């Protein structure tokens, strides 16, 4: 069979940087070749494994995540960084095997005047540990401020939908990777 990467890549809406769409996935066969024959992203940076290799390697579980950031801010998403999204909203674990995809969101997440519905978490009582989620608005004020998504702003301040993958064959069984 398969299992629908569509609902994260080919979806409509987008989750915030603190409330982000976490999704364990398993018992599949996944045509990463689809991820390739898409040819629509901006960046497809793959840690601990090369895109051809993650095809022919055992996968027990996945941890797909869907959200958005402001363009430049995508730099924050890497092992060992600081910033709003880098620490105060997420963190890329340093035992990692999955890998990251991201691309512009202009005619889906922007418009004249801009969009507001996206809210970061600018402060925090605790910089979100690897992969953790503080979906509240705890004080440190409630730090969740929006970002403007304007066609005339900086391109690094244009909205970029990010979708991350995170693989885990700890000891869990088979049924991923396709072939």
């Amino acid at each position: 069979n398969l299992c629908p990467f569509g609902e994260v890549f080919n979806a409509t809406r987008f989750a915030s940087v603190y409330a982000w769409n976490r999704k364990r996935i398993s018992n599949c066969v996944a045509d990463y070749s689809v991820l390739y024959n898409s040819a629509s992203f901006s960046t497809f940076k793959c840690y601990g494994v090369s895109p051809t290799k993650l095809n022919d390697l055992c996968f027990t579980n996945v941890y797909a995540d869907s959200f958005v950031i402001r363009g430049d801010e995508v730099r924050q998403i890497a092992p060992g960084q600081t910033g709003k999204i880098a620490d105060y909203n997420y963190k890329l674990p340093d035992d990692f095997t999955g890998c990251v995809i991201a691309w512009n969101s202009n005619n889906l997440d922007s418009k004249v005047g801009g969009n507001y519905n996206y809210l970061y978490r600018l402060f925090r009582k605790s910089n979100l540990k690897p992969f953790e989620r503080d979906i509240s608005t705890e004080i440190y004020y409630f730090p969740l401020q929006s970002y403007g998504f304007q066609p005339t702003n900086g391109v690094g301040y244009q909205p970029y939908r990010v979708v991350v993958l995170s693989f885990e064959l700890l000891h869990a069984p088979a049924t991923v990777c396709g072939p």
Partner: antibody, heavy 118, light 105 residues
């Protein structure tokens, strides 16, 4: 400024590794692109490595197992090309890159040919 | 994301000679352009197709709309021309068009 290895020639079947060392800024905080330059033809992108993690976004077009590794100790990136073969007798270039999606390759290595014969 | 800008050039120098980056269906606002010299590691000329980086004489300007972009080398002489490659962007395999060699009288 970037510095490669000298010009090289090899056999089919086996593999090779090439390198590129960096000077003048914070290496660990700047991508490095690897670009193939054809023999008497156009260009072709082959990948890039982040210096700090295996940010090896790898163009598929040729899957000669073109693996990228690096080292922040000596500030040198390594391109491990496998399956040396006819389509590879070209000039490979490291290239200075933006750290994230402002990608431009403006500072380069000397360019190294990797000739393939019998 | 295939590019097919301009096979080569053959024109009197000193003129406003245009090389026409015909982008495929993918309208990417971003781009780049690099100057190549014979057996010389090329260097990016036009950053983001509109901004100038430090160290470029203003002989060749870059512009364009959506997908289709252009580079107008204004008043180019017999001292500067070589090959000129176009550099795609965000679309994942950052393909490079088959370039723009520049020959002149």
């Amino acid at each position: 400024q970037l510095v490669q290895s000298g010009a090289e020639v090899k056999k089919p079947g086996a593999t090779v590794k090439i390198s590129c060392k960096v000077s003048g800024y914070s290496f660990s905080n700047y991508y490095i692109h690897w670009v193939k330059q054809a023999p008497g033809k156009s260009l072709e992108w082959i990948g890039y490595i982040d210096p700090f993690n295996g940010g090896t976004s790898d163009n598929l077009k040729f899957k000669g197992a073109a693996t990228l590794t690096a080292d922040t100790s000596t500030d040198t990136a390594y391109m491990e090309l496998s399956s040396l073969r006819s389509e590879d007798t070209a000039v490979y270039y490291c290239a200075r890159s933006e750290y994230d999606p402002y990608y431009v390759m403006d500072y380069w290595g000397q360019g190294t040919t990797v000739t393939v014969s019998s | 994301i295939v590019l097919t800008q301009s096979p080569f050039q053959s024109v009197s120098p000193k003129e406003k000679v245009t090389i026409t980056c015909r982008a495929s269906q993918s309208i990417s606002s971003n781009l780049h352009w690099y100057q190549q010299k014979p057996d010389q590691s090329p260097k990016l000329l036009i950053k983001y197709a509109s901004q100038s980086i430090s160290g470029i004489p203003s002989r060749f300007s870059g512009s364009g709309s959506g997908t289709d972009f252009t580079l107008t080398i204004n008043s180019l002489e017999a001292e500067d021309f070589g090959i000129y490659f176009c550099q795609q962007t965000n679309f994942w395999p950052y393909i490079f068009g088959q370039g723009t060699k520049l020959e002149i009288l």
